[PDB]
Design a protein around this ligand. Sequence first.
Ligand SMILES: Nc1ncnc2c1ncn2[C@@H]1O[C@H](COP(=O)(O)OP(=O)(O)O)[C@@H](O)[C@H]1O
Ligand SMILES: Nc1ncnc2c1ncn2[C@@H]1O[C@H](COP(=O)(O)OP(=O)(O)O)[C@@H](O)[C@H]1O
Ligand code: VO4
Ligand code: VO4
Lengths: 614, 614
Amino acid sequence: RPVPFVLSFNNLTYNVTKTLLDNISGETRDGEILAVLGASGSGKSTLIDALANRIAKGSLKGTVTLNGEALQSRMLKVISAYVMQDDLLFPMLTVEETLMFAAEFRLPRSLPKSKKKLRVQALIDQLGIRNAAKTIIGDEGHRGISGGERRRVSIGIDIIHDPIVLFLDEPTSGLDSTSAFMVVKVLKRIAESGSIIIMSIHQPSHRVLSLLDRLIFLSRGHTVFSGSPASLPSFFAGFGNPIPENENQTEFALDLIRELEGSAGGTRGLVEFNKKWQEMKKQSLTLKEAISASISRGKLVSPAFANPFWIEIKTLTRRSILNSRRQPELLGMRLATVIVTGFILATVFWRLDNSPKGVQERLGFFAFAMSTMFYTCADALPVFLQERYIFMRETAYNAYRRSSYVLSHAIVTFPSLIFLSLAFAVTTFWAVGLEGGLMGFLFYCLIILASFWSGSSFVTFLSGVVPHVMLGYTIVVAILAYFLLFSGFFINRDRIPQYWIWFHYLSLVKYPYEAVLQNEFSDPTECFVRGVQLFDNSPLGELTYGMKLRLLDSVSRSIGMRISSSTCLTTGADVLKQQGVTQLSKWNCLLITVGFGFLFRILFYLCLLLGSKN
Amino acid sequence: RPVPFVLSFNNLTYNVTKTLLDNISGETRDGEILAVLGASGSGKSTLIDALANRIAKGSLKGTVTLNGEALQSRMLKVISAYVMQDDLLFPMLTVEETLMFAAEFRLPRSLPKSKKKLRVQALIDQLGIRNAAKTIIGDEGHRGISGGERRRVSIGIDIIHDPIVLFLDEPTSGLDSTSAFMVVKVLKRIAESGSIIIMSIHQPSHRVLSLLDRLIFLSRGHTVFSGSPASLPSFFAGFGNPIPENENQTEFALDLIRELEGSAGGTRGLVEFNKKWQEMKKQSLTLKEAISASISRGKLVSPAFANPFWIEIKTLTRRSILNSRRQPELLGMRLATVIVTGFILATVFWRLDNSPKGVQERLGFFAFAMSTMFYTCADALPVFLQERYIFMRETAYNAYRRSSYVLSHAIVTFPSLIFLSLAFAVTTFWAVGLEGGLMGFLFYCLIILASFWSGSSFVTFLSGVVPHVMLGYTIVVAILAYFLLFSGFFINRDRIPQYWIWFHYLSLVKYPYEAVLQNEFSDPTECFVRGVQLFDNSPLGELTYGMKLRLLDSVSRSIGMRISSSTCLTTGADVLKQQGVTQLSKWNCLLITVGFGFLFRILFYLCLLLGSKN
Ligand SMILES: Nc1ncnc2c1ncn2[C@@H]1O[C@H](COP(=O)(O)OP(=O)(O)O)[C@@H](O)[C@H]1O
Ligand SMILES: Nc1ncnc2c1ncn2[C@@H]1O[C@H](COP(=O)(O)OP(=O)(O)O)[C@@H](O)[C@H]1O
Ligand code: VO4
Ligand code: VO4
C-alpha cells in the first residue's frame, strides 16, 4: 500500500546558439522505471539534469510538476536523489561501513544510532548485498566486492534517506548483462515501495524491459519515441520500418536512428511522427500531505545539514582514520622516504666541523633537509584528489560542510606529520651535530613539523586546482624547486634581482631554511674562524704555523685591532650576515611557516567554493 | 569449403601443493566456439594457457593434440594466436593504422605492401569495423572508438596472420550486452573460414549461446560440465537440481556452483557426475599437409621475426613519430618546463659578476640547471610504461626484437632532446653571461644534450623496474635528488665520507655539473679576486681603498710575493681546485654523461630479457 505520486513534465526546452532539449513530455507514476534512452551526445544526461533541477533556473522553459506544488528546488533535496555516473567509493571501507557513514551524514541527528543501523541493514537486504555486507569495496589492487555490487553500494549511498523520487545517470554502465539486470531488479524493488525512478540507459537487455514501464528516446533533444516498451513494435511499423522477431526491439530502434540523421535527410521525419503516435493513444489531497502520508507508511527517513559542524568533523575524522589504518603502505612509503633521506643526510653530513667549508655544508644540509619536508608531502597528491572526487559527490546532498571537510583533513594528517617530524629530527640532529642542545632540538622538531604542515597544505591547495595526478605532481615538483631556488640558498636575498624579490618572500622553503640557520648559527661560543683560519684557504699565506701571526699583527697597522692566534673573527652571527639571514627571528620564521599552512588551507577552502559553482 | 582441424585435449593436470587443473578433457573441431566458463579464481585462464603452451613443459601432464602431430610449441607460433585480457592499444593511431602496423610487423616481408593492405582491408570487413576504420582508438580523453570496437581491434591485431587456432582470454569482459554479442558474432565469422576458437567467458548472454557450440565449466580445476549448451538443461535435472524456463541456463548453472562448494559438502559430488554424463552420450591426411591445405584455400598469411632488425626499426620509429605528432601536448609540457625554468634561471642569475659570491651563484646556477635536464626527463615516465605494456603484448608474437625496441626508442626521443637542449642553452648562456664565447656555447649545448640523453635513459631504465607510475615518479624524484646531493655541489668530493664515495661517482648529475664548471672556470683571463678582494668580505680590513695596499704589501713579509692592487689572486682554475673539480676534463665528463646514457639503455634491454622470463 504505497502513496501515489505522479511526476509529470510537460514541455522542456534548454538552450545553451545550440539547443539541447526541445519539448520533451513525460508522465511517470510511482512504481515505474521510466528510462531515457539515446546516444553518446544526445543529451539524456541533460534531461534528467532538468528534472532534478540541476541546471540554471530560468534557462529551462517549462514545468516539471509532481502531483501538486510545482516541484521547485526545495522539495528536491528531501524527497529526491540524483545518482551520478561512477563508483566513487573509498576502497578500504566495508559495504556496511560505507552505508553507515552515509547514514551518519544525512539521516537526522534526532534518530538514534540503533535506528540508523536499522536503516542500513534494511537497505543491504533491499539492494541484495547481504553476502558482501562485510567485504570491503576495493580498488584494482585490494580484492574487494565486484563491479556490479560496487554499483548498488553507489546507489545505496544516495538512497540512505529513502527518497520517493530517484534519478540515476546510467546505473548500468560498465556492467555485464547479468549484473545490469540485478541493478534494475533492485531498482524495481525500490520502485514498489513508492519511489519514482527515472534513469538513463544506453542499451538495455531484453530482461530489463519488463521492469521498465516507460521509455523515452532522444535524438539531440527532440523526443522521437515516448511510451511503453510493448508499444515499441507497433510504433516503427507505422513509421515505415517494421522490426523482425527474435531480435531485441530497443537494439533495432537505436541503430536505426544513428543512420537516420544522414546528411540530406535528418531525424525531423521521426520527431514529428512521435507526436503523431501520442495523440492517437489518448482515446482509451495536497502534495505536502501526500509526502507526510509516505512517512506514515515509512518512505522518508530525513535543516541544510543534518549534523552540527563538530559532529560531522568526528565522522570525517573516523573515515580518514579507517581509510588509512587499513591502507598502511601509504604511511610506509612516506615514512621510509624521510627515514631514508634522514639516514642519507645524517651520514653524508656526519658531524660537520667548524671549517669555512663545513659552514657551506650546513647551508647545504639545511636546504636539502627542509626541502624533504615539502617533497615528501607531494606524495599524498594521489590520495588528495581521490578524497575530493568523493567530496564533490557528497557535497551535492549536503552530507557535510566544506569547512568540516577542510578542518577534519587538516586534523587527521597531523599525527602522521608529528611522527614524520620526530623520525627526521632524531636521525639528523645528533648525527649531523647540530647546535642548540635540547632546546635547539625541540625547535628543530617544531620547524620540521611546521614544514610538513606548510607542505601538506600546499599540496592540498594544489589539488583543487589541478585535474590530473600526473599534471599536478609535475607542477608541484617544479614549483617546490622554485621555492628552493628562492629560499636564499642558491642565491642570497640581497643578490636576487628586484624584479624577482617577491617570489623569494613567497617561497615556502625560505622560512624553514632561515629558521634553522639561526637555530644553528646563533651561539656566541661557537666559532668558525679562530684567528688562524683567515689565511688557510686564502690565495696566500700557506705557512706551517709560523709567520702567520706576523701577518695577523700586520693587520693591526691599518685598524688597531689586536688579532691573536685565536681571536674568533667569525661567529655564527657573522655567518647569518653573510647569507642575509637577518630580517626575521627564528620564531617569526616559524610563524610564517605555520601561517603559510593556514593560508593554503583557506585557499583550498576557497577553491572548493568556486568548484561548487561549476 | 574449409579444412577440418580437430583440437583434442584428453587429460590435463597442472600442479603449482596446489593443483590448478585436474583431468580436463575436450574435443573441438573447426567452426566451433568452445567456451571455458568458471569463477574468479577457478583457473579458466590457466586451461587456455595450457592449450596455448604458455606454461612450463613437463609440468603439464597430458596431451594437447591436433589432428596429427601432437601440437608442441613449434606449430603454436604460425597457426595460433592468444588474445590476452585488455585493450593495450596506442590511442593516437587509427584503426586502419593499428592493423597495418601489425601487418608490417608479423606478415612476412615477401608479401608486398599492397597484399598487406589487402589483408587489413579484408580484416576490417570481417571484424565489422568499417565505419570506424579511420577513427582513432582514443584513451579516456581523446574521443576515439567505442569500448567494444576497441576489442575487435585488439582481437584483429592478434589475427592479422589469420590463425587456424585462436585462443582468447575473456574477449567479452567489460563490454555491455549488445557489444559482447558483436564480439562473438565476428568470432563466429572467424570460426566459419576454418578457425578453432577457444575462449574464456564469465557470464554469457542468451544470444551468445547458439554461437558457442561447446561449453566447459570449471571449479578450481575439476571440470563439472563439458558439453553442448543444449544438453545443459538435461544435465542438472539428472544431477538433482532442475532448472526453470524463462531463465538464462548458464546463469543458473553458475550461481549454483558458487553456493555448492560449501564447508562440509563440496563440489566433489558435481565433479564425479560430469564423467557420468560423458560416458552415456557416446552411444550415438597428415597435419602438415592439412596446414598446407589451409594456405591453398588461404587461411594462413604467415623465421623467428618476419623483418630484419633495420626494417622493424623504421616501423617502430614510424609508430612513435605518429603517436607523438598526434599527441603534441607531451612535448608542449616538457618544452614549457625547460623554457619556464630557462627563463627563471636566466633572469635570477642575470649577468653574474666576478664576485666571490657571484662564483657560488654560478655553482648554484649550474647545479639547478643540470638538474632540470634530469627532472624534465622524468615527466616521460607515463608514456614509457604505456609503450612497454604494449611491447609485452607484441613480444609474445615476435612482432619485433627487444633490441629493435630499445634502439628505436632511443632514436625517436633524440630530435626531441636536441630541441630541448637548444631551448635551454640559448635562454641561459647569453643571459647568465657564461664564459666560453661560441666554442663554450657549443659545448654548453652538448652537455645539456648529453644530460637529456643520460636522464631519458635513466627514466627509461626506471620503467622496467617499477610497476606503477606513482611509485616510479616518487622513486625517480627521490633518486635524482640524491644524484644532486652527491654531484659535488652540496658537499664536495674531498669532503664526502669514505663510506659514501661510490654514489658520488655513480651520480648522474655530477659529470654534467663538473663539465660546465670547467667550461666556465677555465680561462686564464677571467679573474675573481683582483688583489683588493682579499679583505672585501673578510672579517677585517674594511677600509675605503687606502691602507689595504699596506696590508697587501705586508703579505711580502712572510711570502716574498709582491701582491699589488690588481694581481689576480684567484683565476677560474683556483675555483675548480676549491670545489675539487680536478679529476676529469670537461670532454671526459661529457663522455661519462653519454656513457651513462648508453649504460641505462643496455640495463633497460637487460630488464626486458628478465621481464620476458616472467
Ligand atoms: N555538466 C555539463 N556542463 C556543460 N556542458 C554539458 C554538461 N553535460 C553535458 N554537457 C553538454 O551537453 C551536450 C549534450 O550532451 P548530453 O545530453 O549530456 O549527453 P548524454 O546523453 O551522452 O549524457 C554535449 O555537447 C555536452 O558537451
Ligand atoms: N600467470 C600466472 N602466474 C602465476 N600464477 C598465476 C598466473 N595466472 C594465474 N595464476 C594463479 O592461478 C590460480 C588460478 O587462477 P586462474 O585459473 O588464473 O583464474 P581465472 O579463471 O580467474 O582466470 C590463481 O591462484 C592465480 O593466482
Ligand atoms: O555523452 V552521454 O555518454 O553522458 O550518453
Ligand atoms: O581470476 V580469473 O578473472 O582471470 O576469472
